[PDB]
Amino acid sequence: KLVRLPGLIDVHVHLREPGGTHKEDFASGTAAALAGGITMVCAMPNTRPPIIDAPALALAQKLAEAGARCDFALFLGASSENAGTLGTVAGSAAGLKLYLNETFSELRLDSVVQWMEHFETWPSHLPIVAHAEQQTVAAVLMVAQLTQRSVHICHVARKEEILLIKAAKARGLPVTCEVAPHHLFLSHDDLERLGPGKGEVRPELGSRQDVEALWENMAVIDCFASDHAPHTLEEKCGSRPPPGFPGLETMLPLLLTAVSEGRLSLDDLLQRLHHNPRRIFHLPPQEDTYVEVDLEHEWTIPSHMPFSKAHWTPFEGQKVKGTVRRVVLRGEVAYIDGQVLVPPGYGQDVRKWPQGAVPQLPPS
Amino acid sequence: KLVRLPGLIDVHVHLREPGGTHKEDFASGTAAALAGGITMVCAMPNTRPPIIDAPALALAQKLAEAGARCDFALFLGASSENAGTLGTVAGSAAGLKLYLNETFSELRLDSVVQWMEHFETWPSHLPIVAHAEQQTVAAVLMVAQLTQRSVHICHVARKEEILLIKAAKARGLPVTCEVAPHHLFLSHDDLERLGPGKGEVRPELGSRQDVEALWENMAVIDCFASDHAPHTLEEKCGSRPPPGFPGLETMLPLLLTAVSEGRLSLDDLLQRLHHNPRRIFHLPPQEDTYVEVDLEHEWTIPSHMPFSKAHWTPFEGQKVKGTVRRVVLRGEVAYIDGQVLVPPGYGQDVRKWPQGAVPQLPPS
Ligand SMILES: NC(=O)N[C@@H](CC(=O)O)C(=O)O
Ligand SMILES: NC(=O)N[C@@H](CC(=O)O)C(=O)O
Ligand SMILES: [Zn+2]
Ligand SMILES: [Zn+2]
Ligand SMILES: [Zn+2]
Ligand SMILES: [Zn+2]
């Protein structure tokens, strides 16, 4: 007996195209998404070139329209030069991404004043998300309050961070957050097995106490999002390992295992992988779209999942219970039992759909 | 013709006793203060032992009462273990000091949650000051807002920081700040002369643009304070140079030079070295206390000033116009033309004066 889920949404993926296509491309990364029960992804802007201006966004849009197998929206990235220049294209993006800690030069912001300038100039009705670790969470929350708007905190990984966000929510501040599966299912304890190269990720893996705190504070977590960050094994095991884990193909099986164990409910999962992503990012429904999962099937995560070009996974050896059996995307069978059945280019930019535009008040 | 000033107050000094008396002690550091026209100092808690508990404060109080030549108040320091334990002694301190960036282990706070705990537990009517650089200024401001109270930012050194504070003040937030003379009168340009050991200080020396921004934003600066941070030349020039500059003996001559040049007014100076320190820290008046200065005398700062045991200065070679000629403290001549004339122990703890207690509402 299969369970029917709505089309799940991952608001934080790195698909590497343009410029990093040996790591992943739109076609491979969206195959990975479909195999993970994900029918819509929001792609981060730290590509080569980075998506920090209109011409780069135009290029990325065409590459995505040609290569994506599931639907998508593309983030713009904040830079030290582009505040006040993105107004004409802002509404066509998923949102604006700020990289506020070490950054996998072009996206480096060297001053909180630059953060303020982005918060002041980016249209008020459109999303802003931040890579903001530890005290940086408090700092960006202060900027959001000074500019009287909301912010979404990416990949929360620490007890410190989730408790700060909890305190902010208790004061009625408009902040939301997401947590990635590696910060719920891996910890420092796993670094011996992973080794120092594979284990590199930002935010870094937390202590057992960090992991426990995220679970205890599930009510504070608005979304799950993979931070799918593919790099090849050669890169991860080489002399300067880049940070990041692939995660699209493993996220849902890990979380379904947790549901089966009673660690959270099926509804808790669907709020965090469907309803809250929709409402925070103003993402439209996908007609005739659903995912069928098998909750009884037990399996062990192998050394690499079938689709991501990363060709490795930090979850290797973990036992899971839960499998994606079939995905239907806009009336077509997109995935069945390991076979992707929609071609590159089937996916569409949801921000171009009438229902995918973010509502705003009219010029004065 | 001499100009009579009120007794000036330095709210940020390191007097090194207990435990670092080769660098400075209460007797030498307060001689330095008097020679700099300063009649009251607030001493930071990063001594050995650090002033982080009642027994350490009791020791420091007696050492100060026995050694100080000018009046004083002693800060308590926040630690990872002492939130909620300082209530009985809090009112006897200058305030609570938080070290939020690298810290010249016992005072290290590893989580913003620990900052919140201090803001929640320290009595609401008493001062909190923070060493908070760059984004840490925004972060501690967020904690202050979440806990609905004020904060004072120590040694503001950067354009980024003063503009963030300016924005916070424009939003009516209760934040005040101080600036040290090295951040107004030295910059990166001076590092070639100083060398990498002598030049070490936290916050580090800023760019010319940082210095210019502090002057342009003088209206945002509530206090001047030396951050007198004495270390011997051997230490500064050795294999692991500690950060910090001595500054009590040079602060007023540098600032009087600026007054003479029309860079700020005499009143601007007295707001920042007298009235605003009094009002932010609730420090009492000193009866029969004043400073006589000569604004015409030109001199060049030598390789060391007479009193600080640091026995070096980063301002060596700078030409100044302005000299402290006489200081009277509570009716006694304390300093004349290079001679200190009050003994160790003349100084008193102002928090023990009836007028030096901070007013508060009565237990419910
Ligand atoms: N998280 C990572 O470790 N790496 C991400 C960057 C990011 O999400 O910050 C990547 O793009 O490789
Ligand atoms: N500022 C410094 O460079 N050093 C100070 C510490 C401080 O004020 O942060 C010291 O005590 O030596
Ligand atoms: Zn990130
Ligand atoms: Zn990311
Ligand atoms: Zn400091
Ligand atoms: Zn200091």
PDB file of C-alpha atoms in Angstrom, chain B residues 99-268:
ATOM      1  CA  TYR B  99      34.026  40.019  25.645  1.00  0.00           C
ATOM      2  CA  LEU B 100      32.404  38.876  22.394  1.00  0.00           C
ATOM      3  CA  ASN B 101      35.493  38.635  20.119  1.00  0.00           C
ATOM      4  CA  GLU B 102      38.879  36.846  20.632  1.00  0.00           C
ATOM      5  CA  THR B 103      39.833  36.856  24.375  1.00  0.00           C
ATOM      6  CA  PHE B 104      43.481  39.953  25.384  1.00  0.00           C
ATOM      7  CA  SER B 105      39.331  31.402  27.951  1.00  0.00           C
ATOM      8  CA  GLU B 106      37.824  32.395  31.319  1.00  0.00           C
ATOM      9  CA  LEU B 107      35.847  35.263  29.671  1.00  0.00           C
ATOM     10  CA  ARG B 108      35.042  33.454  26.451  1.00  0.00           C
ATOM     11  CA  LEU B 109      31.357  33.209  25.580  1.00  0.00           C
ATOM     12  CA  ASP B 110      30.841  30.431  23.037  1.00  0.00           C
ATOM     13  CA  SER B 111      27.201  31.039  22.196  1.00  0.00           C
ATOM     14  CA  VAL B 112      24.840  33.951  21.681  1.00  0.00           C
ATOM     15  CA  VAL B 113      22.572  32.087  24.109  1.00  0.00           C
ATOM     16  CA  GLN B 114      25.106  32.915  26.830  1.00  0.00           C
ATOM     17  CA  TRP B 115      24.877  36.588  25.834  1.00  0.00           C
ATOM     18  CA  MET B 116      21.095  36.387  26.176  1.00  0.00           C
ATOM     19  CA  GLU B 117      21.403  34.780  29.602  1.00  0.00           C
ATOM     20  CA  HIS B 118      23.563  37.663  30.815  1.00  0.00           C
ATOM     21  CA  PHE B 119      21.198  40.277  29.394  1.00  0.00           C
ATOM     22  CA  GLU B 120      18.270  38.475  31.105  1.00  0.00           C
ATOM     23  CA  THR B 121      19.897  38.055  34.520  1.00  0.00           C
ATOM     24  CA  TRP B 122      22.062  41.150  35.031  1.00  0.00           C
ATOM     25  CA  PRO B 123      19.942  43.778  36.801  1.00  0.00           C
ATOM     26  CA  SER B 124      18.024  45.820  34.240  1.00  0.00           C
ATOM     27  CA  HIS B 125      19.028  49.197  35.663  1.00  0.00           C
ATOM     28  CA  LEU B 126      22.804  48.560  35.548  1.00  0.00           C
ATOM     29  CA  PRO B 127      25.205  49.115  32.649  1.00  0.00           C
ATOM     30  CA  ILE B 128      26.273  46.479  30.137  1.00  0.00           C
ATOM     31  CA  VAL B 129      29.216  47.157  27.857  1.00  0.00           C
ATOM     32  CA  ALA B 130      30.521  44.958  25.057  1.00  0.00           C
ATOM     33  CA  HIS B 131      33.671  44.358  23.105  1.00  0.00           C
ATOM     34  CA  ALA B 132      31.813  43.750  19.844  1.00  0.00           C
ATOM     35  CA  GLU B 133      33.491  44.214  16.460  1.00  0.00           C
ATOM     36  CA  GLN B 134      31.983  44.382  12.983  1.00  0.00           C
ATOM     37  CA  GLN B 135      28.942  42.116  12.697  1.00  0.00           C
ATOM     38  CA  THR B 136      29.168  41.401  16.427  1.00  0.00           C
ATOM     39  CA  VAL B 137      27.848  44.949  16.993  1.00  0.00           C
ATOM     40  CA  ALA B 138      24.680  44.019  15.094  1.00  0.00           C
ATOM     41  CA  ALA B 139      24.447  40.696  16.930  1.00  0.00           C
ATOM     42  CA  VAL B 140      24.698  42.186  20.414  1.00  0.00           C
ATOM     43  CA  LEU B 141      22.223  44.919  19.445  1.00  0.00           C
ATOM     44  CA  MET B 142      19.789  42.146  18.507  1.00  0.00           C
ATOM     45  CA  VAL B 143      20.262  40.491  21.909  1.00  0.00           C
ATOM     46  CA  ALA B 144      19.677  43.858  23.613  1.00  0.00           C
ATOM     47  CA  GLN B 145      16.408  44.307  21.677  1.00  0.00           C
ATOM     48  CA  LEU B 146      15.216  40.754  22.415  1.00  0.00           C
ATOM     49  CA  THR B 147      15.794  41.432  26.125  1.00  0.00           C
ATOM     50  CA  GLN B 148      14.435  45.043  25.843  1.00  0.00           C
ATOM     51  CA  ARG B 149      17.340  46.958  27.329  1.00  0.00           C
ATOM     52  CA  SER B 150      20.316  49.142  26.472  1.00  0.00           C
ATOM     53  CA  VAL B 151      23.911  48.337  25.571  1.00  0.00           C
ATOM     54  CA  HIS B 152      27.119  50.351  25.280  1.00  0.00           C
ATOM     55  CA  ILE B 153      29.613  49.436  22.547  1.00  0.00           C
ATOM     56  CA  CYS B 154      33.270  49.732  23.498  1.00  0.00           C
ATOM     57  CA  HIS B 155      36.042  51.106  21.227  1.00  0.00           C
ATOM     58  CA  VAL B 156      34.222  51.619  17.922  1.00  0.00           C
ATOM     59  CA  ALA B 157      36.897  51.556  15.239  1.00  0.00           C
ATOM     60  CA  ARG B 158      35.324  51.156  11.804  1.00  0.00           C
ATOM     61  CA  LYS B 159      33.083  52.957   9.330  1.00  0.00           C
ATOM     62  CA  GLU B 160      30.922  49.818   9.308  1.00  0.00           C
ATOM     63  CA  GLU B 161      30.393  49.942  13.056  1.00  0.00           C
ATOM     64  CA  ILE B 162      29.684  53.657  13.441  1.00  0.00           C
ATOM     65  CA  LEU B 163      27.193  53.571  10.542  1.00  0.00           C
ATOM     66  CA  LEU B 164      25.372  50.580  12.045  1.00  0.00           C
ATOM     67  CA  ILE B 165      25.153  52.389  15.391  1.00  0.00           C
ATOM     68  CA  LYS B 166      23.980  55.548  13.587  1.00  0.00           C
ATOM     69  CA  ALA B 167      21.200  53.517  11.928  1.00  0.00           C
ATOM     70  CA  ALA B 168      20.206  52.011  15.283  1.00  0.00           C
ATOM     71  CA  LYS B 169      20.045  55.468  16.894  1.00  0.00           C
ATOM     72  CA  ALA B 170      17.878  56.707  13.983  1.00  0.00           C
ATOM     73  CA  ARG B 171      15.420  53.919  14.890  1.00  0.00           C
ATOM     74  CA  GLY B 172      15.397  55.114  18.521  1.00  0.00           C
ATOM     75  CA  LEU B 173      17.240  52.094  19.921  1.00  0.00           C
ATOM     76  CA  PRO B 174      19.003  52.513  23.296  1.00  0.00           C
ATOM     77  CA  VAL B 175      22.624  52.119  22.264  1.00  0.00           C
ATOM     78  CA  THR B 176      25.616  54.267  23.134  1.00  0.00           C
ATOM     79  CA  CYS B 177      29.269  53.952  22.118  1.00  0.00           C
ATOM     80  CA  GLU B 178      32.792  55.118  22.732  1.00  0.00           C
ATOM     81  CA  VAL B 179      35.844  55.670  20.520  1.00  0.00           C
ATOM     82  CA  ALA B 180      39.493  55.418  21.531  1.00  0.00           C
ATOM     83  CA  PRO B 181      42.152  57.894  20.466  1.00  0.00           C
ATOM     84  CA  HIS B 182      44.184  55.412  18.437  1.00  0.00           C
ATOM     85  CA  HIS B 183      41.193  54.913  16.151  1.00  0.00           C
ATOM     86  CA  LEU B 184      40.957  58.678  15.566  1.00  0.00           C
ATOM     87  CA  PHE B 185      44.695  59.475  15.267  1.00  0.00           C
ATOM     88  CA  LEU B 186      46.334  56.328  13.839  1.00  0.00           C
ATOM     89  CA  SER B 187      45.523  54.105  10.876  1.00  0.00           C
ATOM     90  CA  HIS B 188      46.901  51.383   8.630  1.00  0.00           C
ATOM     91  CA  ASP B 189      49.278  54.038   7.332  1.00  0.00           C
ATOM     92  CA  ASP B 190      51.116  53.894  10.653  1.00  0.00           C
ATOM     93  CA  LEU B 191      51.777  50.141  10.638  1.00  0.00           C
ATOM     94  CA  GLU B 192      55.022  50.493   8.673  1.00  0.00           C
ATOM     95  CA  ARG B 193      56.455  52.712  11.430  1.00  0.00           C
ATOM     96  CA  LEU B 194      54.964  50.763  14.343  1.00  0.00           C
ATOM     97  CA  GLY B 195      55.826  47.320  13.041  1.00  0.00           C
ATOM     98  CA  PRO B 196      53.648  44.218  13.417  1.00  0.00           C
ATOM     99  CA  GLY B 197      54.142  43.710  17.155  1.00  0.00           C
ATOM    100  CA  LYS B 198      53.692  47.233  18.469  1.00  0.00           C
ATOM    101  CA  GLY B 199      50.862  47.720  15.972  1.00  0.00           C
ATOM    102  CA  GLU B 200      48.803  44.827  17.374  1.00  0.00           C
ATOM    103  CA  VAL B 201      45.559  46.072  18.952  1.00  0.00           C
ATOM    104  CA  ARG B 202      41.914  44.994  19.057  1.00  0.00           C
ATOM    105  CA  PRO B 203      40.028  46.371  17.260  1.00  0.00           C
ATOM    106  CA  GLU B 204      42.891  46.645  14.801  1.00  0.00           C
ATOM    107  CA  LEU B 205      43.912  49.990  13.342  1.00  0.00           C
ATOM    108  CA  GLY B 206      41.514  50.987  10.602  1.00  0.00           C
ATOM    109  CA  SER B 207      41.893  52.339   7.104  1.00  0.00           C
ATOM    110  CA  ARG B 208      42.069  56.070   6.401  1.00  0.00           C
ATOM    111  CA  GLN B 209      38.415  55.724   5.379  1.00  0.00           C
ATOM    112  CA  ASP B 210      37.537  54.232   8.794  1.00  0.00           C
ATOM    113  CA  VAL B 211      39.261  57.130  10.576  1.00  0.00           C
ATOM    114  CA  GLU B 212      37.541  59.676   8.339  1.00  0.00           C
ATOM    115  CA  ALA B 213      34.176  58.066   8.998  1.00  0.00           C
ATOM    116  CA  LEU B 214      34.578  58.301  12.773  1.00  0.00           C
ATOM    117  CA  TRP B 215      35.383  62.017  12.530  1.00  0.00           C
ATOM    118  CA  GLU B 216      32.521  62.637  10.084  1.00  0.00           C
ATOM    119  CA  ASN B 217      30.180  60.833  12.470  1.00  0.00           C
ATOM    120  CA  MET B 218      31.341  62.532  15.667  1.00  0.00           C
ATOM    121  CA  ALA B 219      27.675  63.195  16.509  1.00  0.00           C
ATOM    122  CA  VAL B 220      27.192  59.424  16.892  1.00  0.00           C
ATOM    123  CA  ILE B 221      30.081  59.033  19.348  1.00  0.00           C
ATOM    124  CA  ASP B 222      28.882  59.336  22.959  1.00  0.00           C
ATOM    125  CA  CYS B 223      32.217  58.991  24.769  1.00  0.00           C
ATOM    126  CA  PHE B 224      35.936  58.965  24.267  1.00  0.00           C
ATOM    127  CA  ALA B 225      37.729  56.317  26.313  1.00  0.00           C
ATOM    128  CA  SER B 226      41.354  55.302  26.067  1.00  0.00           C
ATOM    129  CA  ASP B 227      41.180  51.511  26.222  1.00  0.00           C
ATOM    130  CA  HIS B 228      44.460  51.965  28.068  1.00  0.00           C
ATOM    131  CA  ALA B 229      45.928  48.488  27.551  1.00  0.00           C
ATOM    132  CA  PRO B 230      49.514  48.470  28.813  1.00  0.00           C
ATOM    133  CA  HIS B 231      51.995  45.740  27.917  1.00  0.00           C
ATOM    134  CA  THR B 232      55.770  46.100  28.115  1.00  0.00           C
ATOM    135  CA  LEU B 233      57.870  46.729  25.026  1.00  0.00           C
ATOM    136  CA  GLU B 234      59.452  43.265  25.413  1.00  0.00           C
ATOM    137  CA  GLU B 235      55.967  41.748  25.219  1.00  0.00           C
ATOM    138  CA  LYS B 236      54.850  43.898  22.288  1.00  0.00           C
ATOM    139  CA  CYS B 237      58.054  43.126  20.327  1.00  0.00           C
ATOM    140  CA  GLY B 238      58.257  39.430  21.291  1.00  0.00           C
ATOM    141  CA  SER B 239      57.151  36.215  19.634  1.00  0.00           C
ATOM    142  CA  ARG B 240      53.438  36.459  20.490  1.00  0.00           C
ATOM    143  CA  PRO B 241      52.613  40.125  20.881  1.00  0.00           C
ATOM    144  CA  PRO B 242      49.553  40.862  23.013  1.00  0.00           C
ATOM    145  CA  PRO B 243      47.146  43.411  21.574  1.00  0.00           C
ATOM    146  CA  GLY B 244      46.757  46.858  23.081  1.00  0.00           C
ATOM    147  CA  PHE B 245      48.156  50.349  23.487  1.00  0.00           C
ATOM    148  CA  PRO B 246      48.767  52.459  26.583  1.00  0.00           C
ATOM    149  CA  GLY B 247      46.790  55.690  26.256  1.00  0.00           C
ATOM    150  CA  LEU B 248      45.929  57.552  29.486  1.00  0.00           C
ATOM    151  CA  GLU B 249      48.808  60.005  29.217  1.00  0.00           C
ATOM    152  CA  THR B 250      48.294  60.792  25.540  1.00  0.00           C
ATOM    153  CA  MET B 251      44.500  60.895  25.124  1.00  0.00           C
ATOM    154  CA  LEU B 252      43.799  64.437  26.307  1.00  0.00           C
ATOM    155  CA  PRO B 253      46.823  66.043  24.590  1.00  0.00           C
ATOM    156  CA  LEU B 254      45.794  64.401  21.269  1.00  0.00           C
ATOM    157  CA  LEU B 255      42.186  65.574  21.639  1.00  0.00           C
ATOM    158  CA  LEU B 256      43.160  69.104  22.729  1.00  0.00           C
ATOM    159  CA  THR B 257      45.295  69.314  19.573  1.00  0.00           C
ATOM    160  CA  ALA B 258      42.182  68.450  17.567  1.00  0.00           C
ATOM    161  CA  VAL B 259      40.183  71.118  19.448  1.00  0.00           C
ATOM    162  CA  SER B 260      42.879  73.697  18.653  1.00  0.00           C
ATOM    163  CA  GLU B 261      42.631  72.746  14.982  1.00  0.00           C
ATOM    164  CA  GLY B 262      38.844  73.174  14.999  1.00  0.00           C
ATOM    165  CA  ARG B 263      38.119  69.480  14.380  1.00  0.00           C
ATOM    166  CA  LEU B 264      35.743  69.459  17.338  1.00  0.00           C
ATOM    167  CA  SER B 265      34.862  72.022  20.004  1.00  0.00           C
ATOM    168  CA  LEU B 266      35.897  72.146  23.628  1.00  0.00           C
ATOM    169  CA  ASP B 267      32.265  71.380  24.500  1.00  0.00           C
ATOM    170  CA  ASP B 268      32.259  68.377  22.152  1.00  0.00           C
TER     171      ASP B 268
END
